[PDB]
């Protein structure tokens, strides 16, 4: 979030996050974090969940163009530079960055494509900037009506209105599949009560039942069991396995 140098909407930057204790209060507590929109999860509940992997994508886009950063949307960003899955689970966080990323008739660092041959697949990236030919005429250089140059710059000038001011965006993609969990909240772990009807929470797997020493041979790669109807029958303790 504090990376002074953010990437363009095209060729966006992605960071693989794993094996950490995640505290989201540092983020949504700050006032300048203008937008905090979460899909498939609520901001209040983030600190109480566990995730197998977390991907942090970032880029700079127009202020009025943040609407396009959402599942299943259509448009320039949603189709040719950054597309989210329709069933995307995660959070989208954006805030104004005009004071940092604007120069009068400048700010050429951030670029974006306007059209592409085919819509990008979810989380797809295209770093190439080769000249786009019309198909009816072989080409090797820019020729206006044919042989287009795909990339163009916003040219953020402080004189622009909010609709065109640069906005700094980050996307927190989550995977909610069961154990192993690489990223988890700061929830404290209590002792293991056995042979008693207790309320348990194994890496976010909440329920009520009696925990008993299992006798079914899980293979080392298995860390969570299911019975008929997909009900959880057994689980391996994350603290002692």
């Amino acid at each position: 979030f504090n990376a002074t140098r953010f990437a363009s909407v095209y060729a966006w930057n992605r960071k693989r996050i794993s094996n950490c204790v995640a505290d989201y209060s540092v983020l949504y507590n700050l006032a300048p974090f203008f937008t905090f929109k979460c899909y498939g999860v609520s901001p209040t509940k983030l600190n109480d969940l566990c995730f197998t992997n977390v991907y942090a994508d970032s880029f700079v886009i127009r202020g009025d163009e943040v609407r396009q950063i959402a599942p299943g949307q259509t448009g320039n960003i949603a189709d040719y530079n950054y597309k989210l899955p329709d069933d995307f689970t995660g959070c989208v966080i954006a805030w104004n960055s005009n004071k940092l990323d604007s120069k009068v008739s400048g700010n050429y660092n951030y670029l974006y494509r306007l059209f592409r041959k085919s819509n990008l697949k979810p989380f797809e990236r295209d770093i190439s900037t080769e000249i786009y030919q019309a198909g009816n005429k072989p080409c090797n250089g820019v020729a206006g009506f044919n042989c287009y140059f795909p990339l163009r710059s916003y040219s953020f000038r402080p004189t622009y209105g909010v609709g065109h001011q640069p906005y700094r965006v980050v996307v927190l993609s989550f995977e909610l599949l069961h154990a192993p969990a690489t990223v988890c909240g700061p929830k404290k772990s209590t002792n293991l009560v056995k042979n008693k009807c207790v309320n348990f929470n194994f890496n976010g797997l909440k329920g009520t039942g009696v925990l008993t020493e299992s006798n079914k041979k899980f293979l080392p790669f298995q860390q969570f069991g299911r019975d008929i109807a997909d009900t959880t029958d057994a689980v391996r303790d994350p603290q002692t396995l």
Partner: antibody, heavy 123, light 109 residues
Framework: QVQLVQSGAEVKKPGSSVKVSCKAS????????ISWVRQAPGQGLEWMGR????????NYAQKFQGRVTITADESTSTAYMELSSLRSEDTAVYYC????????????????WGQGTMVTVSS | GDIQMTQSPSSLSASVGDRVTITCRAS??????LAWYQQKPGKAPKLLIY???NLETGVPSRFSGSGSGTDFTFTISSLQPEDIATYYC?????????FGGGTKVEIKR
């Protein structure tokens, strides 16, 4: 790889106009943009203007607006700059560098430079 | 108006192996948009530090720098004979780029 090559030293009288160039080679011209830097004898660097040939935008320093003009083309993969009505103070070296801070990550730091071109103004 | 940088000290003299530092300052707080160049007499400038605190490809670890806002510092862990040159700070917060007055460093004896 990417390289820039400048022309040889040029000389002409005060009040005339000086043309300078620097070849662009390697990579692709569509990925290039050019700047122009000065080094007169016995002091530090100085900057004149900036051009992005593929975007068509150019800018000049306030001390060089109007007097300096920047142009480039892709057929020769070269950039041309002109300065008019030279004073004796215009005796300096001309440097063009692969333009910087043009996109994601590349910074307004001049990475690749030409070999230079000395110009002197005298009667 | 145009942003003007001040480099202090203007001149230096230290023997090979000694710790030396260079500083460059701007009139108003720039958002860490600063870089450093090395220029031998009559030679093309060479990029050493591009971001306020990052090193360019192939630059020896002998060179380092840090700073934010208005004042910045450029330090060398150990001077070497090749260090007879002038180093310039380049500010790029806004397009009207300025080049520092340059700090000239020589070998002491």
């Amino acid at each position: 790889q990417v390289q820039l090559v400048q022309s040889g030293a040029e000389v002409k009288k005060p009040g005339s106009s000086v043309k300078v160039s620097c070849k662009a080679s390697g990579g692709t011209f569509s990925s290039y943009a050019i700047s122009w830097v000065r080094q007169a004898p016995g002091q530090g660097l100085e900057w004149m203007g900036r051009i992005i040939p593929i975007f068509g935008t150019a800018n000049y320093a306030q001390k060089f607006q109007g007097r300096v003009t920047i142009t480039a083309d892709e057929s020769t993969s070269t950039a041309y700059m002109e300065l008019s009505s030279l004073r004796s103070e215009d005796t300096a070296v001309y440097y063009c560098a692969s333009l910087a801070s043009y996109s994601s990550g590349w910074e307004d730091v001049f990475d690749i430079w030409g070999q230079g071109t000395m110009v002197t103004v005298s009667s | 108006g145009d942003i003007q940088m001040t480099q202090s000290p203007s001149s230096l003299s230290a023997s090979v192996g000694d710790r030396v530092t260079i500083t460059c300052r701007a009139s108003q707080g720039i958002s860490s948009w600063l870089a450093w160049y090395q220029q031998k007499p009559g030679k093309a400038p060479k990029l050493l530090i591009y971001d306020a605190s990052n090193l360019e490809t192939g630059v020896p670890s002998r060179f380092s720098g840090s700073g934010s806002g208005t004042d910045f510092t450029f330090t060398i862990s150990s001077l070497q004979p090749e260090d007879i040159a002038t180093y310039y700070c380049q500010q790029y917060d806004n397009l009207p780029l300025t080049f520092g007055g340059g700090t000239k460093v020589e070998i002491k004896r």
